[PDB]
């Protein structure tokens, strides 16, 4: 029952307290980003974007070394490795021609967009026989940019909020 | 009666207890949803089920079953059941 | 008491027995040849898995069997159970999948397999050690995935990348 860190997706300085469960892409869309007016003018707190074991990228949340510990999560060693890898990169970019910095920024942007796609449903493949009290079935989702071995079941109330079109098409492809 | 007959065992799986019978056909699943949805050892209801190919019915009529349900329906060919087990 | 651990299952196939392990790395293949060359039906089969090793870059993925993993004491075995479960699941769904759905499946898996092929190709070399080892930026992967590699090894295929590197110093 203790979550596990599968991978560190990104790092940022953001508003203090802008972490966990209210920072998921869908919590933000439904109630607003707790990091919403953060730009210069309010001091920051280093935060890490985390991909959790057994949960799809749409459940990624931002966290701090502290919230991680407070929740007694597993995989903490990855945080240590991530910090060491970050410093190595920062250092190996010591001088580095504007050409190298230019390449770095360009590539880092391609991968960043890549990762955002892991959060969008590319196609609904199936649904559950059982419905929620709200009358929602769960959906088997195929994510953009990831192979079918990455498909996962998702609460219907959840993806309907943003992917009602994929749901509609799924049912339409059948009668 | 008009006794059904197991022709061949096609597959096997540990599935949600109750996710067997007519509701498991490919057409019932594409129309009403899969009763085995997101199952796994996390909960039980958790039983061993076999995908059964029936005599006189194309593969779209194949259904997941259990010894329990099999015996209940009095299907002919139970011999291939313990033959599949081993 | 060194132990290797499974990070991720990249693929699965039926292949000639023994065509697993070190000699199945893309660089060992290019060097000495593929132990699964023109395997058929013709001879004993065997389900093998392509695995990405934790602590190693994609150029080091090797094919393995549920057996070679256990003989080596590889850790992370629990991921093998999930993968199989999942594969029988999608191989299953595939049996009655519609023509339209199956084609969408093949196109996506093609794209996916292209992306994975890039992970093994150096996109840049951003640092050498004091044949020297090189810090490689891998094509298609974040800078957080760069890794140090034996120079003798990367020079065999990415000599041009070490020259663009040294031409900027």
Curated annotation (Swiss-Prot), chain A:
Cleaved signal peptide residues: none
Domain Chromo, first and last residues per copy: 3-94, 119-173
Subcellular location: Nucleus; Cytoplasm
Tissue: Expressed in many tissues including in the brain, where the highest level of expression is found in the cerebellum and basal ganglia.
Domain of life the protein comes from: Eukaryota
Family, similarity comment: Belongs to the SNF2/RAD54 helicase family.
Function recorded in the entry: ATP-dependent chromatin-remodeling factor which functions as substrate recognition component of the transcription regulatory histone acetylation (HAT) complex SAGA. Regulates polymerase II transcription. Also required for efficient transcription by RNA polymerase I, and more specifically the polymerase I transcription termination step. Regulates negatively DNA replication. Not only involved in transcription-related chromatin-remodeling, but also required to maintain a specific chromatin configuration across the genome. Is also associated with histone deacetylase (HDAC) activity.
Domain comment quoted from the record: The 2 chromodomains are involved in the binding to the histone H3 methyllysine at position 4 (H3K4me3).
Disease: Pilarowski-Bjornsson syndrome: An autosomal dominant disorder characterized by developmental delay, speech apraxia, intellectual disability, autism, and facial dysmorphic features. Some patients may have seizures.
Subunit record text: Component of the SAGA complex. Interacts with BCLAF1, NCoR, SRP20 and SAFB. Specifically interacts with methylated H3K4me2 and H3K4me3. Interacts with the FACT complex, the PAF complex and the U2 snRNP. Interacts directly with PAF1, SFA3A1, SFA3A2, SFA3A3, SNF2 and SSRP1.
Protein name, per record: Chromodomain-helicase-DNA-binding protein 1
UniProtKB/Swiss-Prot annotation, chain B:
Highest rank taxon of the organism: Eukaryota
Tissue localization of expression: Expressed in many tissues including in the brain, where the highest level of expression is found in the cerebellum and basal ganglia.
Subcellular localization(s) per the UniProt record: Nucleus; Cytoplasm
Domain Chromo residue range list: 4-86
UniProt note: domains: The 2 chromodomains are involved in the binding to the histone H3 methyllysine at position 4 (H3K4me3). The CHD1 helical C-terminal domain (CHCT) binds DNA and nucleosomes.
Similarity comment text for this entry: Belongs to the SNF2/RAD54 helicase family.
Subunit structure, interactors included: Component of the SAGA complex. Interacts with BCLAF1, NCoR, SRP20 and SAFB. Specifically interacts with methylated H3K4me2 and H3K4me3. Interacts with the FACT complex, the PAF complex and the U2 snRNP. Interacts directly with PAF1, SFA3A1, SFA3A2, SFA3A3, SNF2 and SSRP1.
Disease field: Pilarowski-Bjornsson syndrome: An autosomal dominant disorder characterized by developmental delay, speech apraxia, intellectual disability, autism, and facial dysmorphic features. Some patients may have seizures.
Main function: ATP-dependent chromatin-remodeling factor which functions as substrate recognition component of the transcription regulatory histone acetylation (HAT) complex SAGA. Regulates polymerase II transcription. Also required for efficient transcription by RNA polymerase I, and more specifically the polymerase I transcription termination step. Regulates negatively DNA replication. Not only involved in transcription-related chromatin-remodeling, but also required to maintain a specific chromatin configuration across the genome. Is also associated with histone deacetylase (HDAC) activity.
Record protein name field: Chromodomain-helicase-DNA-binding protein 1
Source species of the chain: Homo sapiens
